[model samples]
Target chain A: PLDTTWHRPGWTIGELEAAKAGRTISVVLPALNEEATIESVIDSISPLVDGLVDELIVLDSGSTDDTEIRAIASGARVVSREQALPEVPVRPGKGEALWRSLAATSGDIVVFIDSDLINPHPLFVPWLVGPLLTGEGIQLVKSFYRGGRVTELVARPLLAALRPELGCVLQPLSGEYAASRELLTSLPFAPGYGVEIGLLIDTFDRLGLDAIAQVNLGVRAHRNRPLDELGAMSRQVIATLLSRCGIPDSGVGLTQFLPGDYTRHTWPVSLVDRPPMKVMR
Target chain B: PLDTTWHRPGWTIGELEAAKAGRTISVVLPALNEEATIESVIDSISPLVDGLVDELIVLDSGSTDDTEIRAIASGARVVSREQALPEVPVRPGKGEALWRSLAATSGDIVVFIDSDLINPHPLFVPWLVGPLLTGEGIQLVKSFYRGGRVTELVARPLLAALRPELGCVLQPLSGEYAASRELLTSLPFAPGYGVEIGLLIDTFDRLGLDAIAQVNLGVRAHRNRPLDELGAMSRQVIATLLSRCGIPDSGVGLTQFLPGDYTRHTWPVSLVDRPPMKVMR
Candidate 1:
């Protein structure tokens, strides 16, 4: 059963240590243009997070705005999306940042978070990181909300049919999760919008129902993407579902996609060449 | 000869762009703990910097305090020492931070700044990034100070050793300047505490006399290293000089050889890392 309890006052280090021991913990912030809220986020979480987590990293895609600066100022190790995965040409999106963040990090366990979340709990990092450290081989945990974004109009029908057994899990697509690096490397990552749904299905297929557990860290206030943004997101999510269910990537495109009024203008994609390093004469 | 003068005020973007053509510029800030001043710094300089720089960045080592949060809130891109070269794990020091910053950034022209500076002119960023843009491959630009940390004892001896040809430059280590990034990058950087001295010598050695220029960015009120912390800084600055001049990294332990009578202790270092993706099973 998913523990959906909201946290009382400040949860101490003792509770975190009791929950997990002898493993390094790392926190990740997957963000875009989230400068304003990120400051308050850091201030609220830093005391608990600084000493406990081995590292506090924020991976940003091409933020035309100052979110990267805000993250760095918050004592976070900010990595540019381009620098995170030199192998993959960087793109603009949250999931892309999360994928490359894996390469840049070296931690026993990693925690994923969205940067735009407002007033996220200090307990969020520890609560998620805790179970992963102490519980042997627990590969997946889904965070449920007191009021989740899952029951919304667009995703409800698909969400209901996908995992009826875990429908009670609530907010199965919640962006926050705590997982081991080993699992991350092996798992197929979502590039733009498929991350949460991809994680749930893949983890269930591999690790099974018994290996997963959920704990409520507390409340989270995250910005909801517009309906048009959700449509693109749905395409990505459905693509992941179809591909994982033995459908090929080639089979999922425009003909297989549903048209929606909410369309986002994407950046033009292009190819680039890398330069060789040399001693400047 | 260098154009050493106070920053002329009230040039609209249209006027400045008309006046200066076919040039490049960059802005750099050497940051530590500075939450309070960051907002003030950004609000005043944003307009000027937008018109002036090809690139603008903040070089931060590890600020355990709220300095980073303020920096993000202020629109500075907080770059880490480790981001430039992953193989070379960062050694904590402002000079090292600055030197590494030079490696990470791309700009034909450059500027350097102290993050904690107070009441900076809206013209400061423009004044620095502007001169380099207007001038022809200007080798250096030092800043003039009415009253600031540079007007203190530690910087006096370094300034006194200035070459006669470059004597028109006041406040040689004023923590503010704009110049060609090419000139800034080509020089050997001091890794510990010698960044300024190294820059001075390297510029003179590489570019010769009459290439360096200076401008007044107005007064800066910043914090100094406490007496106890001063000894460590002295060691850092001295080490920076020695290393920049091709001295050995080992066989020189400055802290051991020089002891301080000051009893106030303060040299706290933070451990930072990039976290991996979280797991759920």
Candidate 2:
């Protein structure tokens, strides 16, 4: 049964490890051209290597920069999105990276930390994984913060109307979260920027509210985006949520203002669900 | 068939009158607490009453300020939202004001100009009505400009997905537009901020793209709103679009973050379609 959402349950890495009770943990970072901040993000969370997180990886998804090289230099295993599943053809987009990362790693618990996060936390991993370990019957933990209009305007309002049970979710579009292998493998992923909201709603649907925990990370500042990019992000998020609400689409793409000459531009930003990994066999 | 949208067909006021063929026009301003700018808005359009506009009115929707008094001071007839249709208890909303304004006036053509505009243009109404008069088979004309995040982020992206034919429309949520009474009286109004969008899509669905015309109003200065109010506006817009797409929703309301203590607050922003005036009997 769905009950109250757990606010951040204060717990240190040692407490998190004690509660882990020998369960292996995999921390996965899905990244693109994030060379500048990737090293520090990896460095901040490197302390968890002591006795907490067993396997840490950066799933590089077509980054043209030194993101993978710098991530390796910071002592984290870097796997290309392609090598994650050697036989199947590699697809593009963020969600595809996360889905394939599940196939590449081995751990009872998997924590997804975005590679673009600035002011990365030492206990961010601990905050996400702690609820899954310390709390009974918890299958997932979500980190909550600001993405501005996408969260406040597009995602939350739509969720408020369609998925009322998810009202307690502070940041449904937040990049970082933790889930057990059993849960992550059994759910479908929307292959785009829609990944975050799709995972949140799909998680809520699969396991009741009791299975979810929300951690209040006072402030999260990853990167600034142009309004054009934000508009595109909101489009994909709209696609994912509307599709889940059983709203059909005609596949006619998104049209936006071209800032250069103030003309209109259209792009196909459709979302299709990748099969659950448990069925990949 | 819906073809490419017309870029602004620049027409002067004299040319618009020559094409008007002596049709009666009603220019209605739906206002609330617009005392600061209401008189100027009325003054800007007062010139049209000479031979162009047959009726001019300010539809006051429960303003506790000097809005109605000043509207009359500027020589525009002021009608209360409740007094328009005395039989039915009046609803509270911007759209409700527009719908009620319909019953109060007698005009072959209706133009809605928001009372809160700044730097109001003398030729604004001419730009809107010119397309309807000059363009063959044109039943509706829309004025396009900015509302920042609500337009750029939420409204346009959603329309780009759901109502792709509307892509050519610059601003789907612009407050200023002109349409025939025959077209407006036949469409249902979403009784809130969703009014503009609901009318646009409904008009498109009723009459194909050829029936609608786009007028570029280079700049529209309206009052700025807090992000909180913008979030609330986005919620109603979402409700209207999803409903039109046949998406079923529960009575679940909108939940937003409270700025002060950062707790969540929920509000019922659900949209109910007001029956078309033709069906009001």
Candidate 3:
């Protein structure tokens, strides 16, 4: 059955208080050079800390900017990606940051939010977390936003092609999502732009459609990246998706045109999936 | 080298006339149920009928609406899909109308314009044709619009994977494009949404990178369709792309969910490519 637990009209403070009684929830903002909007995103969920959420973790992948400074200043327990998993060599992707963040916090329910949102709202956290708290079978909460280039171009079409079951998910690659620790620990994390999609596919395959729910996050507005940048992002997404679907790696890297004398750049994206954390344990 | 023949600042009426001196140009509007905006599209290009364009054809697929009436009323030689090719059975796709339109008229060059534009400009014809007329080696002119769904999702990603050389063409699946008759007749057409991509890949494969050019056509606005419709469209596109790249048809079709109930809709999209018209002749 399709999950019908949408963010309905009224979810009052009392209702939220009653719903989050026993479960320990952790809110995570996966950040990298998002100084422009990370503060507001943190501020929106400030009221929920120590009440609904036990901790707020901002997992920072190396930022040359003052993103770490701003995130720390915005009332988040900031953990650098490398520092979170010191035993293993660190990677340079969003999924690596998220996978490492799991080691940094011990919340039964984890809600990951994107730091680069123009209209960060308090409702985003509660709505995402609502399903896991109230519903009996729901183990994962994916977000649906009116997304930009990558979602429309790479994610949706690929979903329609490979995994039609996941086609029901509006924004499969949306940065915001929530999952039970059991579900999260049992799935491999794709280490880049493919993280969101990687999680969605793995979740649907392992947990089935009935266990997953999606909440409407209204419109998400942010800076549109260049087409060339999106090309690289989509490549990571495709490589991740193909590998997860058991397609053998072609091993041939995609060639792209960069500026300056039509210079060509080719790099092999690691489509490796980090083993389920539970197995690692 | 990347072709930089986008819409320049000043292209006077005299410049258009001077560029199209001896060559006969034919303009085609391949339309379906586009009653609201078809007439204005024809009206915009009426000025260039005899002087620049030798013929103005509206090759309409079956439209129960008044699209054909409106197009014919607005000074176009409207031909229904069946009428254009009486010897063979007519199919029900955009490429069918476009392929049939080839036999309906004779011109050294053909320009195709979309009928669903909110802002139909006369400059689209001259600008698209400009590269073909002015440049020495260019055989095709593709239009780049800040497009809606399909261009970003299906077309761009497929190009990145299969035909990265065409990745710079901006909008590979754009409806509005101009090409020499020799190029058009020599390449096979993918019968559905894949036509645009099929043409791009085939042209690149046949003529090399130097034969193609793209123009910036400001913005295009139209009624965006539902995602399910786009799913079928992308399937055809993917099938076409895979077949072109010598990947044997998996013969497996994609399934999608329509609104209301958990009802499943499954359909096989044929990836058959129409043989090059020149070979048929």
Candidate 4:
């Protein structure tokens, strides 16, 4: 276990150069109704992406708030998920937005972030997509904490047990991540709570463990709602886990025992019903 | 239904004095590990409380962090729930702390707040407790929001159907609030997730329709968790509703219909299994 203090997530410009010499990256912020925090996030990440990234595409899920206007104000190519999937009207979800965003963008590597974070560090942009840009072998990047007791005590322990061998990944359900275009297009995307975790598991399975990496992106001080509201998210996650392991949520409990990685431990897990979608038909 | 703009919470000193004069008030902050945000909150609310409140007490629940030390450093009388109930160990929850705070304090009105809020305002301190203090026998004090879209779309609709009569209460489950200590101490405390919602429901159940008041505390910047984590919170809320209404878990599908004022709601709903004690126990 890494000590808390040593986990500072500051990357020098030399490290930046070492990370992104010739990287073509695009930053995609999936915003719903976030207007307050979007402005600063857009302002901070845009300059960092200047020389490094070819495009900054913001995918809005029908933001009634000025999220679209703010994104446009910040000089981002803002597009609605509705316009992207005009024929197959996708529901409003982070995963659906991401999948639709994939359809809209044509970057060599794509980095995804939720738009509600406050005073985000510029390194998040470079850090997530860096490994993908620098090396050919690594295809997936997971974001984790530099320092926070609450996250480690609650989120990390749960995630560690849930998706054990994905140890090359630190924070599995981390919304902030970077992936190659090929990896992005091919994965089974569950839009609700399953999106982040599902992406990690699917990527690990298809590309093998060697192709994945995890990076500490410092303290993510986003809003944490009371756990009661997280049921939809939990349901989505369980669905994605079952789908990835090819386990049917039959009466029998699904069990998996896998060898541990150098990073974390193995977790035996099961799943229940998939969250019903109105458009499932 | 009120116009979107009038509901906006904008705090000023005039409003604070209007709410505070002759109101018997005490501010109770239920604290655990809130080292990062506590000091700032105290500094912001101290002068207002000194000018307005009868007393301010920090009900600490065995914080492993510097929350107690900082709360002391901020000049509030720091007392442990252990001191209040040495026989029965103090439960680790906002609800327990608020309940125990009643035994530890002596004010006609009690205002409760979470220690994790980044910015503390005087308006919440006065307005929440003000109704009971200023009105003709007001029994409950609740907080709500007026402007933000996320607050409007997500929080408002949920409250409208459940406790429509309390519709004016805005952020009903808001951590910040002021209430009559008479009503607070007399009502059986709902520990853990059940506390906030349970308090409102029980108060309304006992005090009848005219006993509640909602105050707009202006813009409060606090940390919010990711959407996925809201399951436990929702579970707690729904569970609290069921438990208080004498409805069985099997009856959960049925809507909780408590006749009341239609313009408000409450905060800190209960998650069934994960009580605030579950973390400590």
Candidate 5:
């Protein structure tokens, strides 16, 4: 049902332009330290800068490296997280950058791209935004790809148990997605890795299931740490999905065992959700 | 608070006998087609049968092979899952077999051991049963070991997010545990892999956290099939934990991707909770 809603596996710019009418589009890349692939990611996205994407902004989440310089030299405007909503007092992680990015850009439609892609292509923006442009009543477009350890291990299991309607979503934790600025401002943003899934469930509930569509964007190859603070990542992912189901929060972080001795160690990452941009006091 | 309840890491049989104080104990091995390691597990458990444990029953979950024969040859009373509670229609899975085993055995206290053990030891039964015998208020004793992929990837992450109090448990999904027959009969059992975690969280809630204790039973060497239907395992685990936390049930099994084409395929496992043994009328 979700796949057939928007029957465009491959869409041309002319089709999108006609469907778009007079709408404006914004692309926001949330980055930490991506100096190695920042230039490549930006260059790959440059093809859509030809009157399609109105603005490209890389929202830096306190990168201590030259991610800002590379993002700037590649012709994308860069804004530090603190600059977007200076009054809120800056917080770290991808969700904060995304929440703040809403205030930094002005577009009818918004697209989110991760900054560390090793195989980013211009079609990511076009394919993600294609459904919204070509179809009526579509409020969100999610990119489905064959990557993500967190998706398979942590996210999907929780979804299957609680929110099985969203279980039909191929990659529930895919970072690449596009939504209308109207819908984006109405929902709260969960911190860190919880961002992607939080937006997904919150979107489904607020808009109902039929308003959402998915596009198989082929395989995504982003930067790899080769590993994760999976405990931390899994913690936030589970927290977001469970919280969405009207479940009460347990208020404790993940506790994992150490090497050899198997001594207990607790890793605390924030699972707090920032307020919706439209309703902020 | 839960940790400080039972402090015995190593307790002698004499002390356990003294603590027994006219109480009866039953050790149950829930088996399913384990022809290879049936005798080893049964033999390793023999030392406890001298005076401490009152009965040793291997409740086979429909093993068509030499499991019943091998277990009987090793001097264990083999009871098929169907033989116990003949009125209730049989449902295959670890939990159903366990729920049925309750009526089949008669003892003051019950200990459950998995039929598949790569490293069976005489101390496993003794140590698992030690805390319950040696302590006063402890209603349950869980075996703390150093193995389990599902623990790190699936179980711990779900516990950390929802049931954080039970997160103090070393292995929320450990198949080896002991509980008072009085307590066991009073609680409902979730089917399949959901049984262990369902009991842990339910016990913690019914009897306060201090009623539960963990015994460091050393590294367990359970038989390895090498991999799991983890999506199925994870689905039940998450369902059980989330249900215990007062969330509404969604009633859908896990959907995972097939190899290569990444086509979505679901592996369904039962997530239904059997009624408490005491209220079966």
Candidate 6:
């Protein structure tokens, strides 16, 4: 019964406390140079301080600004990518930092939310995690909202072509999702912008369709990235999708020349997946 | 009034006799080397011979095969592109054939259907023409079905970017439609594969959304062209869309090297639209 009608408002402190009486829940924010919007993201979810979110960790990836300090000021324990997993080599991508964050904190369930959302909602984290607590077989809960350029142009056509089963999922590449610790540690993590899509496809593959659910989180407005940056992002997403489908890659990067600027921008968007942590353990 | 819910089956001999009354209706097929598929397309609608359809013309684009002979055997008056408009210089494309067909036939309403359709339904012609006969404001009725690769990957994104006002039209480049002679004669047609999309955008721009209608034709099953052919088709579509949006092209064509064969396919696809038939007159 994976119906789209199941939508409840953000959980109150009392409701969350009652539900997670004995279970532990963790909230993690994967951050970069997000000094402008990190504080609001943490402030909105401050209600679930000790009860629902037993642990709140902000995983930073070498932020040049005061992102870590601001995150700590808003009542979050900050952990850098270097300190999260010292044994492995650190990479300069969101997926790599997220993979390393698995060893940084301890909780039965983990919730990952992006830090750069313009108006971060308090209910996004709790509502996303609520379905997992109530449903018997649900292992993953992805957020649904109006997707951006990359989703419509690059990802959607690929989905229709390669994986039509996951076509109903509104926002496949949404950065915010809640998953069981067992499920999170069981799948390999894609170490680039392809993390969200890779995880979604893997979840649908490893776990049946009944094990997944989506929460309508309404509109998610964020700052638009530069065209050159978007080109690189789309390249990584396509590379990750192709690799996951067992298609062989013939190239390492995508090069594009814009109309105004004659200089060509080349993005080294190769696909690499980290092995399941359960096997490593 | 221009809702998509308005759809009726193709007219039977009895129904066509009743619907035609005193008005003249014509059906045209733009064909090129479609000898294998054109006969069945003409047979399905053969019931409307002289009652509803005053003329059934097959406008050929210099086919080497006996497509014209086969079409004429199936009860259609065949006319080559050069004979249709001998006064004007002949061009080599589907749109050129269709543009010339306008001058060769006499009808208050014109219905256009592609000849290469594998499963040509009887309802395609009559059902598409139903809206123009019933609705007072609707001047055009476009067919919508499960589109091909070029529609989803190339045309859809361009519509979303350049001509979002015409975004709701399900199948913009669908090769089946019915329109009033007034609207058809007043609009410019793209001189290549970009014809369908060009007509849709121009119709919306001139007649507004209320004048347009779309019919659900279930699933459209047709022969899938080669990847290189699709590349050329998409390039023309993109170039046509960009030019209409007041944008200029820079690159020559999209070059794609086919795997295993190591052969390169390049198409010098560009945009050129025929002047309005009213202007030519």
Scored on chain A only, each candidate's TM-score is 0.79, 0.94, 0.94, 0.77, 0.93, 0.93
Error of 5 at B29 (Å): 1.6
- Candidate with the greatest lDDT versus the true structure: 2
**Best candidate according to DockQ:** 2
CAPRI rating of model 1 = incorrect
lDDT (Cα, 0-100) at A20 in candidate 1 = 51
Question: Against the unseen true structure, what C-alpha lDDT does each candidate score?
Answer: 0.56, 0.82, 0.77, 0.60, 0.80, 0.75
Put down candidate 2 lDDT per residue, A4-94, tens digits, no spaces.
Answer: 3545457766777888787899989888999988998898877777579888889999999999899989998899977999888887788
Task: Tell me the TM-score of model 6.
Answer: 0.54
lDDT of 3 by residue, A125-185 (tens): 8888777877888999988754365665456656766676676676788889899888888
- Error (Å) of candidate 2 at residue B263 is 3.5
**Best candidate, TM-score:** 2
Summarize candidate 3's per-residue lDDT along B112-169 as a digit string, tens digits.
9888888677788888888787788899988875534566555665566666666676
Q: Tell me which of candidates 2 and 3 scores higher on TM-score.
A: 2
lDDT (0-100) at residue B181 of candidate 3? Answer: 91
Across B114-232, the per-residue lDDT of candidate 4 in tens digits comes to 88887766456655654454467677767654222223322232233234444444454677766776566667666564577777777777875577766655557766764333433
DockQ of each: 0.01, 0.70, 0.18, 0.02, 0.47, 0.03
Predicted structure 6: lDDT: 0.75
* Candidate structures ordered by lDDT, highest first: 2, 5, 3, 6, 4, 1
* Tens-digit per-residue lDDT, B1-281, candidate 1: 24445444344666656655655555667666666666676566565555655566767667777866777777777777677556666676666676666666666666676667776777676566444445665667777654222222222322222232333344545567666655655555554444665577568667764566666554567665443344344444433433433432222222111123212222322112111111100
**Predicted candidate 6 versus true structure: per-residue lDDT over A38-98, tens digit per residue:** 9988888877777678888899999999999999888888999989888777888988888
Docking class of 5: acceptable
Evaluated at residue A251, the lDDT of candidate 2 is: 60
Worst 10 residues of 3 chain A by lDDT: A253-262
Model 1 scores a C-alpha lDDT of 0.56
Least well predicted 10-residue stretch by lDDT in candidate 2 chain A: A1-10
